[PDB]
Design a protein around this nucleic acid. Structure first.
Ligand code: MG
Ligand code: MG
Ligand code: MG
Ligand code: MG
Ligand code: MG
Ligand code: MG
Ligand code: MG
Ligand code: MG
Ligand code: MG
Ligand code: MG
Ligand code: MG
Ligand code: MG
Ligand code: MG
Ligand code: MG
Ligand code: MG
Ligand code: MG
Ligand code: MG
Ligand code: MG
Ligand code: MG
Ligand code: MG
Ligand code: MG
Ligand code: MG
Ligand code: MG
Ligand code: MG
Ligand code: MG
Ligand code: MG
Ligand code: MG
Ligand code: MG
Ligand code: MG
Ligand code: MG
Ligand code: MG
Ligand code: MG
Ligand code: MG
Ligand code: MG
Ligand code: MG
Ligand code: MG
Ligand code: MG
Ligand code: MG
Ligand code: MG
Ligand code: MG
Ligand code: MG
Ligand code: MG
Ligand code: MG
Ligand code: MG
Ligand code: MG
Ligand code: MG
Ligand code: MG
Ligand code: MG
Ligand code: MG
Ligand code: MG
Ligand code: MG
Ligand code: MG
Ligand code: MG
Ligand code: MG
Ligand code: MG
Ligand code: MG
Ligand code: MG
Ligand code: MG
Ligand code: MG
Ligand code: MG
Ligand code: MG
Ligand code: MG
Ligand code: MG
Ligand code: MG
Ligand code: MG
Ligand code: MG
Ligand code: MG
Ligand code: MG
Ligand code: MG
Ligand code: MG
Ligand code: MG
Ligand code: MG
Ligand code: MG
Ligand code: MG
Ligand code: MG
Ligand code: MG
Ligand code: MG
Ligand code: MG
Ligand code: MG
Ligand code: MG
Ligand code: MG
Lengths: 77, 62, 103, 94, 22, 46
RNA sequence: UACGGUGCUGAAGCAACAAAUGCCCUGCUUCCAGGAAAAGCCUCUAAGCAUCAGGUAACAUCAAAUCGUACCCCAAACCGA
RNA sequence: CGAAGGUGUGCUGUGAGGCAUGCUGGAGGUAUCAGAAGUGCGAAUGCUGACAUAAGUAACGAUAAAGCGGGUGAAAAGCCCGCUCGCCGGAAGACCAAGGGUUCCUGUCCAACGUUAAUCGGGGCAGGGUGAGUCGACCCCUAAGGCGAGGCCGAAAGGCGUAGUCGAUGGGAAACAGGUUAAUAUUCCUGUACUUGGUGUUACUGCGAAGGGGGGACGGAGAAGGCUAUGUUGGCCGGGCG
RNA sequence: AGGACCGAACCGACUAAUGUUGAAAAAUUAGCGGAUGACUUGUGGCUGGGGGUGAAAGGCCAAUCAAACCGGGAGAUAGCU
RNA sequence: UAAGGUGAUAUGAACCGUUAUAACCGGCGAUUUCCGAAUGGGGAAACCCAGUGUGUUUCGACACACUAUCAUUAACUGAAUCCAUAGGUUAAUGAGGCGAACCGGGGGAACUGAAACAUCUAAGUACCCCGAGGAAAAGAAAUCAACCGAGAUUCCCCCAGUAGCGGCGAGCGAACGGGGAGCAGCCCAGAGCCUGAAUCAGUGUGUGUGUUAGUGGAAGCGUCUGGAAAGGCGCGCGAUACAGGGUGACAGCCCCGUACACAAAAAUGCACAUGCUGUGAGCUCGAUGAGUAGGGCGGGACACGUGGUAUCCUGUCUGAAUAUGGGGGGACCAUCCUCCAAGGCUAAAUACUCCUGACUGACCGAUAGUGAACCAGUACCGUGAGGGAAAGGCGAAAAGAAC
């Protein structure tokens, strides 16, 4: 599923309007990419599927903080 | 009847029940014939099957 | 509970045979009683080849409701509704009018 | 070896017929009516230790019952396994 | 005994395009 | 003419039968409907 | 005899020719569009082995279920009311 | 001493309509003003249920085809028997397939069912009827696919898909000939054979496998060669001298 | 050797009469074409509706098809009857 | 509890008991083949086929028990690559599945309306999907007003179809404020100090408090009609009972029943107290929830549709402040007022009867009423989803009409 392993950024739905203001049923897709993350406190590479906001929250909130929180919330790496 | 059969063994009932089954099966084999002119013998023998077979579980493992 | 007992001697309030007593033969399903000598009616019968019957107009005794009969009183010469006391702890039937136990 | 408790339930009745009244004498065979969970073990050990007689070999089938109509509503009689039991040379039931 | 009361055949709209008036 | 229906139980009872309508999802949304009326002939097992 | 049946007896039982769309044939020839798998079986070995076990060479065995089996089947019995 | 409902009569208001009453009917109706309405049938090619209409008309489901004697009976054109006569015979014959669920067999029974009558029936009713180490299914093994933990992917359900485990119409053990009942029988019976599993002993002492290989193992056409199932004729045997 | 010929079973549906509340809601009769192949067929697995499949006819997808059928918003709505 | 039983159409055969172990009713149990989440593998549901540790064995074969699957906690084992690592093998509680309405989320339309129709409405309605409880949600102020204040959430009545939005058309629709029902506030982002301390959440127990069977319960007799009095016609009686139910037609006094009075060995709810099982109120204070607030970018929820748009939510790149700040007070600014966001907990009031009991009702009385008063979600019809019938009246008891 297109679900970010960090943010919880689930896809939502809007209506693509127009210059004549029409209405359809679009989707918005979160910005997922696979990635590998170095860890020294475990000394390995951890794989992850992560949003583009996640790949900048991971350089502020500490890598091992999220890597410990994901053991607790219920979504394994 | 069970207030009389309550004071018997663990293993004497495991000959009593087989004797009742032997005569019950005799009654079932005479139930082929148009001679067994007792109706309630079969049902009361089924009730004596019932009381004995429930005292069996009421003693053996209770 | 059914205050009209089995072997009691009851009398008939109304019907084709009012006034006359009887010694109750039995009672059927939902209270209907068969007075031995009152509810009398002819019945026809085809002769049957089972149990050796020759056929005839057998007069058997019919049924009647509880609300037609009542227990006859030996003392006052009429009927009486029946009530229940608890004498000695025993639930025992006893008469309403004249206040004295029957058995 | 089948225990006596299971053994004693396996029969209902012998079965009267014209083919029983031919297989009794002209081929010396008997016609049981057994319960539906009976195999050739549960009749080969069951003719023996219930009449204290012997047996040659056993055979069975599964008779499927007819369709009856009591009143105007349909009815289906219970099926019942019919067992043919051949008795050895020198045998005779009670 | 008794019996039923049948009805409602696929009556094929009772006609072809017979009356070719053109 | 060969009619609308030439029977074959060997496929009828696996393309309509009880375990077939229990294997999918919305077969459990037909077996969840036939009990509302309470069908005594529940499905096409004989 | 139950005049429907059945019980009890019983000779000859050979040859030749003809002959397949049935067998060998799952073969042969020959052509191109180039014509299943796996198991039962045949067989060889390591992880394992022990003078054991298992192995086929014998034979007395003991066993080998459960279910289908009636009936019609190009039809008066299936599908077409 | 006769309530609601039906029925006939007899009056009566300008009307929808009431009052009275003979008859059927065998337990409820209901003043008088008032209140609330699923409140009034000629339709609606309305909808159910009944009876008419054509009408005692068409038609009786092949142009293979019936006639007669005897019996059963209250009954015979069909039902049983018996003799002719027709007709199929690569079907309209026999056994089975996928299918159907007592239709098979006797004992009855005629109301309804058979485009008639009915003793008859695939009709009702009562009883009787299927037998296996070998035939088949189940089972050992796979094809096309299906399911499919994981895993990958998808708003969620789910979607394909790996190992697997499912999947006949095909691949793998076996056997036949005769007799029998009103019905089954390669299954029952005498007859004589065959296989496949664990056993105990007899001598023999390399078995070992989720692995290795040979096999199972395969298309279409024609062409012959020897052959039998069967068929014909003779020889024979039995009957007959038309 | 043959999408070779004549002609069976099998398919197929060209012509004509009959049959059209018929025997049959597409057939009988008598003639007809293919008939070792792009065949036909048994049984079984696969293809889902704005989709399938189609020697492609807008034909077929359970006797219904220029969007199958079964419930539902449905008391869609109808300025017309 | 008890003088009659063995369910019914449906009688009969053959039986059992009378001082309470006949039956009947209630509470707890033991039974509970097979299919079904099916859970040993599989499988056209009701069948087919096994593996393992263990008890008999007339060594033929039996009887019992267990084995899915993930999640979770592990114990142990465990390779590419040595210590370590994915994966593997066992245990144990949890969970799966079903079920009507009701609630909360994640997706999401159309004929119709505007007399056409796209923006709009129809509407977050039908319908699917997830998840949970008997209630759910929401929640204890970065909320409104207006210099005076109020004081969480929900729900009902108003304000009001107003002020607004809108091809300014169709139509939609507030809020501030006021009456109510009903009230309970807390806690972690944290150290210490009372340290085991108020409370709190299960345990069992006593008392009531019901629920699950039960028991008594008033009083009336004679005449005429007729099949029959329960009727009319006399004379009474009872009434903390004159509501209904049936009895050969209208019954307070015939009969079950009510008003009333009582009742439990066992189970069990709903409370106070209880010995506990486990968790902890009280003071000094510090410290105030960063990829967040707002904005660039579209968007959908606010009555609020591009509008002159505040507020909140977020897919996308951005992005600070930190008691001196920061948000809001319907662009925006200054003043003033008021409030501490980026974390949790939490009852009733409200919504709902598949199912349970009791009553009523200007509700139906067989073409009605639920599709069904009768054996109906059955027969019949469709491969299937699904649709869907018709069908009560003898009489007082069958007294069913022998010969
Ligand atoms: Mg829209
Ligand atoms: Mg009483
Ligand atoms: Mg009475
Ligand atoms: Mg299918
Ligand atoms: Mg046969
Ligand atoms: Mg035919
Ligand atoms: Mg037809
Ligand atoms: Mg009338
Ligand atoms: Mg009148
Ligand atoms: Mg009258
Ligand atoms: Mg009357
Ligand atoms: Mg009345
Ligand atoms: Mg009206
Ligand atoms: Mg009319
Ligand atoms: Mg009119
Ligand atoms: Mg009309
Ligand atoms: Mg009409
Ligand atoms: Mg007519
Ligand atoms: Mg006429
Ligand atoms: Mg005419
Ligand atoms: Mg004419
Ligand atoms: Mg004519
Ligand atoms: Mg004809
Ligand atoms: Mg004819
Ligand atoms: Mg004749
Ligand atoms: Mg004839
Ligand atoms: Mg003849
Ligand atoms: Mg001929
Ligand atoms: Mg034939
Ligand atoms: Mg039958
Ligand atoms: Mg027959
Ligand atoms: Mg006839
Ligand atoms: Mg006649
Ligand atoms: Mg016959
Ligand atoms: Mg018959
Ligand atoms: Mg058999
Ligand atoms: Mg045999
Ligand atoms: Mg596959
Ligand atoms: Mg799949
Ligand atoms: Mg999975
Ligand atoms: Mg397999
Ligand atoms: Mg096969
Ligand atoms: Mg095979
Ligand atoms: Mg075989
Ligand atoms: Mg036969
Ligand atoms: Mg090999
Ligand atoms: Mg070939
Ligand atoms: Mg030969
Ligand atoms: Mg020969
Ligand atoms: Mg001559
Ligand atoms: Mg064609
Ligand atoms: Mg043509
Ligand atoms: Mg032709
Ligand atoms: Mg040709
Ligand atoms: Mg040709
Ligand atoms: Mg065209
Ligand atoms: Mg079509
Ligand atoms: Mg469509
Ligand atoms: Mg459409
Ligand atoms: Mg709607
Ligand atoms: Mg409409
Ligand atoms: Mg009973
Ligand atoms: Mg299972
Ligand atoms: Mg298997
Ligand atoms: Mg399964
Ligand atoms: Mg629109
Ligand atoms: Mg439109
Ligand atoms: Mg419009
Ligand atoms: Mg809450
Ligand atoms: Mg203030
Ligand atoms: Mg009383
Ligand atoms: Mg935070
Ligand atoms: Mg803001
Ligand atoms: Mg933001
Ligand atoms: Mg903004
Ligand atoms: Mg914006
Ligand atoms: Mg904060
Ligand atoms: Mg908060
Ligand atoms: Mg009526
Ligand atoms: Mg109705
Ligand atoms: Mg059907």
């Amino acid at each position: 599923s297109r679900v970010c392993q960090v943010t919880g950024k689930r896809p939502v739905t809007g209506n693509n309007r127009s210059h004549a203001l029409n209405a359809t049923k679009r989707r918005f897709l979160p910005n997922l990419h696979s990635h590998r993350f170095w860890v020294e406190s475990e000394k390995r590479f951890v794989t992850l599927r992560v949003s583009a906001k996640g790949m900048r929250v991971i350089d502020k909130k500490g890598i091992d903080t999220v890597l410990a929180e994901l053991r607790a919330r219920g979504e394994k790496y | 009847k069970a207030k009389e059969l309550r004071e018997k063994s663990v293993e004497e009932l495991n000959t009593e029940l087989l004797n009742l089954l032997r005569e019950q099966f005799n009654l079932r084999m005479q139930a082929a014939s148009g001679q067994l002119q007792q109706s309630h013998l079969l049902k009361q023998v089924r009730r004596d099957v019932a009381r004995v077979k429930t005292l069996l579980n009421e003693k053996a493992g209770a | 509970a059914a205050k009209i007992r089995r072997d009691d001697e009851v009398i008939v309030l109304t019907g084709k045979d009012k006034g006359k007593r009887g010694k109750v033969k039995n009672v059927l399903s939902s209270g209907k009683v068969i007075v031995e000598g009152i509810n009398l009616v002819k019945k026809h019968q085809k002769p049957v080849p089972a149990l050796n019957q020759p056929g005839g107009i057998v007069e058997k005794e019919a049924a009647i409701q509880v609300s037609n009969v009542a227990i006859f009183n030996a003392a006052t010469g009429k009927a009486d509704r029946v009530g229940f006391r608890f004498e000695d702890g025993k639930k025992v039937r006893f008469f309403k009018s004249n206040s004295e136990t029957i058995k | 070896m089948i225990r006596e408790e299971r053994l004693l339930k396996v029969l209902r009745a012998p079965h009267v017929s014209e083919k029983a009244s031919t297989a009794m004498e002209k081929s010396n065979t008997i016609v049981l009516k057994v319960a539906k969970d009976a195999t050739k073990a549960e009749i080969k050990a069951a003719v023996q230790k219930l009449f204290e007689v012997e047996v040659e070999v056993v055979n069975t089938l599964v008779v499927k019952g007819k369709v009856k109509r009591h009143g105007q509503r349909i009815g289906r009689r219970s099926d019942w396994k019919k067992a043919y039991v051949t008795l050895k040379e020198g045998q005779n039931l009670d | 005994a008794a019996a039923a009361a049948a009805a409602a055949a696929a009556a094929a709209a009772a006609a072809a395009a017979a009356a070719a008036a053109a | 003419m060969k009619r609308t229906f030439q029977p074959s139980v060997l496929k009828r009872n696996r393309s309509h039968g009880f375990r077939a309508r229990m294997a999918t999802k919305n077969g459990r949304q037909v077996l969840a409907r036939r009990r509302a009326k309470g069908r005594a002939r529940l499905t096409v097992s004989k």
